[PDB]
Symmetry: C3
Subunit: 380 residues, 3 copies
C-alpha cells in the first residue's frame, strides 16, 4: 500500500542539494531543510528535519537523528537516507505508519557528513579508501575527543559543525551509517588498552536491544556473515557487534554522542561493498527499509516524562534523571521533558536537580512501548 | 499613479543578490526568496516568490513563473525581472492592479538562470556569444530532453536545478526571456525534420493568444520588424512566431515545460541588442512593463476548478483534465485544484481519475476571464 | 545572577558560522539569522536579529544595530558581539534586564563586516595592518561616499551589501566597533579642510551623550588614556572624541549612516591592541559588557511616536520630523512610526508631510527615558 521511492541513483552534491530542496519545497508543512556548517571545501552540511511541526522542539517529543556518509566512499548510507526523506514525505498522510512517526517524533536526517570526500570517490570501489577521509585528509570518525586515547588530528570543520549540532538539540536516539561491512556496531568503540576486546558501556543492555532492532530486520545482516568470500574472518551473531571487540576505534563520533550528550548512537555497516554500482541501490533500500523504520521507533521505548518544579508547576531545565544501577545519567530539556531508553525490567529512577529536593520513583518498563513518568520537585 | 522603478542599471551577481535580499527583507509579508540549486560556479539560482501568502500554494491559486538570462549575454531579461520585483513590491497595497495580482496569483521570478555566463559577458555586445553558454560551455537552451532530437550535451546543473523546480510547483503559465530579436516565440521549437517550418502544438490556438497578449503591448515588437538594418530578413506578423518555423531549436526549455508538466511556456525575445548599454535600460522597461503585466494575467483565463472525491467531498490528487479535441491533458494538484488555459469557445471537458468514474461537462469559455468548473467523482 | 558567556576564544569564519547557527537554532523564538551579501571571497555577511518577534518590524519598536570587525585585524569587536549574542539568548526570560531589552527593541548584530580580512590576520598583532583592508585591498571605512572628500576607491561588495542593509530597516541607533585605540569616536569624521580639527554635526550634543553612555561604563576608557606607552600622545577626556578632531577620516561608514538614513552611528575603539591573544578575551568582555548594554538602551531616549493621517486615522509613510534648531530631520517608517534622539531639554517638533498640513508641538524631553508624541495630520 505505501509508496516506495523511485529516485534510485547515486546523488552527487549538486543533485543531492536539488533533491533535498525539492522535498523541502514540495512539503513545507512537514519539512525544514537547514545547514549546520560547511565542509572544508565549502559544501553545506545539510539536514532535513521531518516533523509535523518543523522547526520546533515540542515538549515530550523525542528528537531523533540519522547521519550518513561520514566516510566519503561509503555511499549506501547517503542514498538510503535520501530514499527515506522521500518515502517519509511521500507517505505522510496517506500511510498510517509514516504519519504516526512524523507526528510523534522530530526526525533529523543528514545524508552526508563528508560531502567533499564523496566527490573524490570512485563508483564500484569495494574496499578502497579514496575519498574516505575529509578534504584535509583526516578520518572524521577518528576526529572526535575519545574517552581513552587522546586525539591528535586537528578538529575538522565537519566534526566541529556536527559536535555543535549534537548540542543544539535534545537528541535521544541516533545512528550514523557506514559501508565496508554488514553489522550494527555499538559502544564502546575502544578501550583503555586499545585492542579488539569487548568494551562494555553502562548501557550495554539497551544498546544490544537497539542494535538488534535494526539488524533483526535486515535479513542478510541478521545472519551474521557480512560477505564470506571478502573478509571471511567476520562473524557477527545476529548482526550486531560491540565496536571495540570488532576492532579498536579511538576518536569516533559514536561514543562521543553518548559521553557528551543524552543521545545514544549506534554505528551501522550497511554492506561490504562501500561504493556499489548504482544498479544495486534499489536492493539496498528494499533490504533496509523496514530496518530504518523499526530503528526510529526505538526512540519511544523506555521511560520519559517531565521534571516539574512543585511551586511553579512547570518544567525544570537540566534536571538529572538517574537510574537504578546504570551509571549514565540523563538531563532534561527547556520544558523539563526527559527521555531515557531502557529495557523491559524494573528500575528505580531519581530526579535530581540543583536547588531542589530529589524524588525517587520505582518504575516498570515492559516489553512494548514507553512509560510516562513525571517528577514534581520541591525547592529548598 | 503607480510607482515606477528607479534602480536602472546592470546588476552583476553580487548586487543582484543584494537587490533581491533588500526586497525580501523590506517586504517579508509578500515575498519569499529562495535558491533552487547552484550554477556550475556555485552561484545561487535565486527565485523571488511574490504572493500575499509567500511560501504556500493555496488551492485554486494559479502558480506563475518568469525566467530570465538563460543565455548569459542576453541581459535585458535579467534587469526587467528585477525592475518587476521592485515594481510589484513597491505598489502592493498602494496600487489596485498590483495588489489584485499579488493576491490572486503566486508569482515566481528567477532573474538569471545562467549567472556564470552573465559574468563573462561584455556590455555593448549586440549579437556576440561570449557568455551565452554556461560555465562548461553548453547552451542551456539546447540542454533539455527534446521530443524529436535526442540531446547529447550532458545535463548541466542549472538545467537539472530548473527541471526539478518545474516539478516542485503547479506552474500554469510561464515565459523565459531572451535577447537577439524582438518577438514572442511559441511551441513547438523544432520538428521531426529539424528544419525551419511551422511545427504545430495541440495547443496552438491558446499559445498564439498568449504570445499576442504580450506582443500586442510591446509596440515596436507588435510591428513585426525586430531591427530592419541588423537581421533584415526577419518579419513577424504582430510580433509572435512559432519557434520551429523561425528556426529549429532542439533541447529547449520552452517545449520541455509543456511536454513534461502542466506549465505552458513561451520564449520572449526582448530586442536585437543582447547586452545594451545601461543607459538604454529604462527604455526597455517602459516598453515592456505593460507587456509583462498583461502577460501574467493570462494565467487566469480559460478554465479552472477542483476534482472532488464524491464520498470524501475533498480534492483528488493527480486527476486528469482532458479537453474536447485538444490532445494535451492536464493534471490536478494536492487540493485537487486544476487550471486549464483555453480560448473563447465551447469545449467538452472530462475529469478522468484512477479508482473513480469519469465525468464530462460541457463548458463555455468566453472572451474575458476564466470560468470555474468543479468535477465531483464517484469511486468504483 | 545573570549568566555570563563562556565561549571565550577567537572565532574564525567556520566556527563563527557554527556558533551563530547554534544560537539561531537553540532559540528560534528570539532569533533570526540572515546574510546581507557575500564578502569578495564569498563569505556570508551574517547578522543576528534578536527580538521577541524575530523577522518583523513592529510599529513603534526602535531598530538597533551593532557592527564589528570592519577592519580585519581589529578582532575584539567580533568576539564581543558573539559574547553578546550568547549573553542575550541565554538570559532572555531568566534575566529581567535582557528580557526587557529583547522585547522593547529589535536588535541586529553583525560580528564581522570584513571576514576575508580577518582570515588574513595574525593573532598578537597590536598595531599592524595585515588583514585590515578587504580582499581587494581597500579600507572598508574609507569606502563610503563622503560628504566633503569625493571617494575614489571602487565600491566594495561588503560596503554595498551594508549600505543596502542600512536602507532595508528603520535603524535608529548603531555603533560599529574597532581596535587600535580606546575611545568612542563620534561625528563628524572629517571636514572640508581634511585636517584634525573638531568637525561639529547638527546633533553634536546628542552624540556626545551617546558616546559617553558607553565610555562612562568602560572604566579604563573613561579615564581618557588609551595606552600611555604606545601612542602616548592620545588623551580623550572621558573616553569620547569627535572623529575629525582626532584625525580626518573621509569615506567612513559612521558619517554615511547619519547623512543618508535616520540612523545615528558612533565608532567605538575597544583597545589599543588590535588582535590580542585569546587569553585576554574574557577581560575585554568583562570591561565592555555593561557598556554594550547601556549603549543599546539609548535607542529609547529622546522622542518617538506616529504621524497619523487625520482622515484615515493611520500612519503616514515618510513624513518628516523636524526639530527646534537642529538641522537634521528624521523620516517615518511604514506604520508612520518615528524615533528621534535628543537630550534633556525643551524642543519644538514639526511633523511635515507631502499632501498634508504640518503640525508643530512643543515637547519636553527630560533626563530619563523617552517621550511619546503623536502627530495627526490633515490633508489638503
Ligand atoms: C585518513 O586520515 C587518517 C587520520 O585521521 C590517517 O590515519 C593516520 O595515518 C598515519 C600514517 O600512518 C598514522 O601515523 C603513523 O602512525 C605510525 C604508527 O604509530 C607511526 O609509526 C608513523 O610515524 C605515523 O605517525 C596515524 O596513526 C593514523 N591515524 C589514525 C587515527 O588512524 C590515514 O592515513 C588517512 N587515510 C589515508 C588513505 O590517507
Ligand atoms: C555553446 O554550447 C553549444 C552546445 O550546447 C555549442 O554547440 C555545439 O557546437 C558544436 C561545435 O560545432 C556542434 O558540434 C559539431 O557539429 C558539426 C555538425 O554536425 C560536426 O560536423 C562537428 O564534428 C561537431 O560535432 C554541436 O552540434 C553544437 N550543438 C548545438 C546544440 O548547437 C556551441 O558551440 C557553444 N557556443 C560557443 C560559442 O562555444
Ligand atoms: C588599504 O586600502 C587603502 C585604500 O582604501 C589604502 O590607502 C591608500 O593608499 C594609497 C597608497 O599610498 C594612497 O594613494 C597614494 O596617495 C599619495 C598621497 O596623495 C600619492 O602621492 C600616491 O601617488 C598615491 O596615490 C591613498 O591615498 C590611500 N587611500 C586612503 C583612503 O587612505 C592602503 O594603502 C591600504 N593599506 C595597505 C596596508 O595596503
Ligand atoms: C506530568 O506532567 C506533564 C507536564 O505538563 C503533563 O503534561 C500535560 O498533560 C495534560 C493532561 O494530559 C495536558 O493538558 C492540556 O490539554 C488538555 C486537552 O488535551 C486540556 O484539557 C488541558 O486544559 C491542558 O491544556 C497538557 O497539555 C500537558 N502539558 C502541559 C504543559 O500541561 C503530564 O500529563 C503529566 N502526567 C503524567 C501522568 O505524566
Ligand atoms: C467547487 O469545489 C470547490 C472546492 O471546495 C469549492 O470551493 C469552496 O467554495 C466554498 C464556497 O464558496 C468556500 O466556503 C468556505 O468559505 C465560506 C466563507 O467565504 C464559508 O461560509 C464556508 O463555510 C466555507 O468555510 C470554500 O472555502 C471553498 N473551498 C473549500 C475547500 O471549501 C467551489 O466553491 C465549488 N463550487 C464551484 C461552483 O466551483
Ligand atoms: C498615538 O498614536 C499611536 C498610533 O496608534 C497610538 O498607538 C495605539 O495606542 C492604543 C492605545 O494605547 C493601542 O490600543 C490597542 O490595544 C488596546 C489593548 O492594549 C485595545 O484596548 C485597543 O482596542 C487597541 O487594540 C494600539 O495598539 C496602538 N496602535 C494602534 C495602531 O492602535 C498611541 O497610543 C497614540 N497615543 C499617544 C499618546 O501617542
Ligand atoms: C547541567 O547540569 C550540570 C550538572 O547537573 C551542571 O553543572 C555541571 O555541569 C557539568 C557539565 O559538563 C557536569 O560535568 C558537572 O558534573 C556539573 N556539576 C558541576 C559541579 O560542575 C551544568 O552547569 C548544567 N548545564 C550543562 C550544559 O551541563
Ligand atoms: C499521475 O497520473 C499518471 C497518469 O494519469 C499516473 O500514471 C502514469 O503516469 C505517467 C507519468 O509520466 C504517465 O505517462 C502514464 O500515462 C500514467 N499511466 C501509466 C499506466 O503509467 C502517475 O503515476 C501519476 N503521477 C505522476 C507524477 O504522473
Ligand atoms: C521621502 O521624503 C522625501 C522628502 O521628504 C521625498 O522626496 C525627496 O526625497 C529626497 C531623498 O533623497 C530628498 O533629498 C528630497 O529633499 C525630497 N524632496 C524632493 C523635492 O526631492 C522622497 O521621495 C521620499 N522617499 C525617500 C526614500 O526619501
Ligand atoms: Zn566507515
Ligand atoms: Zn537567447
Ligand atoms: Zn579600525
Amino acid at each position: 500500500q505505501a509508496v516506495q521511492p523511485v529516485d534510485f541513483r547515486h546523488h552527487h552534491f549538486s543533485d543531492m542539494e536539488i533533491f533535498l530542496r525539492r522535498y523541502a519545497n514540495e512539503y513545507p508543512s512537514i519539512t525544514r531543510l537547514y545547514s549546520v556548517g560547511k565542509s572544508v571545501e565549502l559544501r553545506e552540511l545539510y539536514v532535513m528535519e521531518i516533523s509535523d511541526n518543523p522547526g520546533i522542539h515540542e515538549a515530550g517529543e523525542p528528537e531523533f537523528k540519522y547521519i550518513g556518509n561520514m566516510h566519503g566512499n561509503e555511499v549506501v548510507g547517503r542514498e538510503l537516507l535520501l530514499n527515506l526523506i522521500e518515502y517519509l514525505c511521500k507517505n505522510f498522510g496517506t500511510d498510517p505508519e509514516v504519519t504516526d512517526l512524523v507526528q510523534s517524533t522530530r526526525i533529523h536526517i543528514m545524508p552526508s557528513m563528508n560531502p567533499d570526500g564523496y566527490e573524490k570517490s570512485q563508483e564500484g570501489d569495494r574496499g578502497g579508501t579514496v575519498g574516505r577521509n575529509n578534504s584535509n585528509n583526516y578520518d572524521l570518525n577518528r576526529n572526535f575527543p575519545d574517552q581513552f586515547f587522546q586525539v591528535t588530528d586537528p578538529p575538522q570543520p565537519e566534526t566541529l559543525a556536527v559536535m555543535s549540532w549534537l548540542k543544539t538539540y535534545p537528541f535521544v536516539l541516533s545512528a550514523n551509517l557506514h559501508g565496508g561491512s554488514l553489522v550494527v556496531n555499538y559502544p564502546f568503540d575502544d578501550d583503555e588498552q586499545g585492542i579488539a576486546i569487548y568494551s562494555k558501556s553502562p548501557d550495554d543492555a539497551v544498546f544490544q536491544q537497539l542494535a538488534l532492532s535494526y539488524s533483526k530486520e535486515n535479513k542478510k545482516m541478521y545472519q551474521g556473515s557480512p560477505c564470506k568470500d571478502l573478509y571471511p574472518t567476520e562473524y557477527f551473531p545476529h548482526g550486531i557487534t560491540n565496536g571495540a571487540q570488532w576492532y579498536n576505534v579511538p576518536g569516533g563520533m559514536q561514543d562521543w554522542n553518548y559521553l557528551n550528550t543524552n543521545c545514544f548512537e549506534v554505528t551501522i555497516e550497511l554492506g561490504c561493498v562501500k561504493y556499489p554500482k548504482a544498479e544495486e541501490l534499489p536492493k539496498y533500500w528494499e533490504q533496509n527499509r523496514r530496518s530504518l523504520l523499526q530503528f526510529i521507533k526505538q526512540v519511544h521505548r523506555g521511560i520519559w516524562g517531565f521534571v516539574l518544579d512543585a511551586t511553579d508547576g512547570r518544567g525544570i531545565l537540566n534536571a538529572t534523571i538517574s537510574v537504578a544501577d546504570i551509571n549514565h545519567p540523563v538531563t532534561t530539556y527547556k520544558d523539563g521533558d526527559y527521555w531515557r531508553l531502557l529495557v523491559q525490567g524494573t528500575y528505580k529512577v531519581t530526579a535530581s536537580a540543583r536547588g531542589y529536593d530529589p524524588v525517587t520513583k520505582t518504575v516498570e518498563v515492559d516489553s512494548k512501548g514507553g512509560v510516562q513518568v513525571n517528577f514534581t520537585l520541591s525547592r529548598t
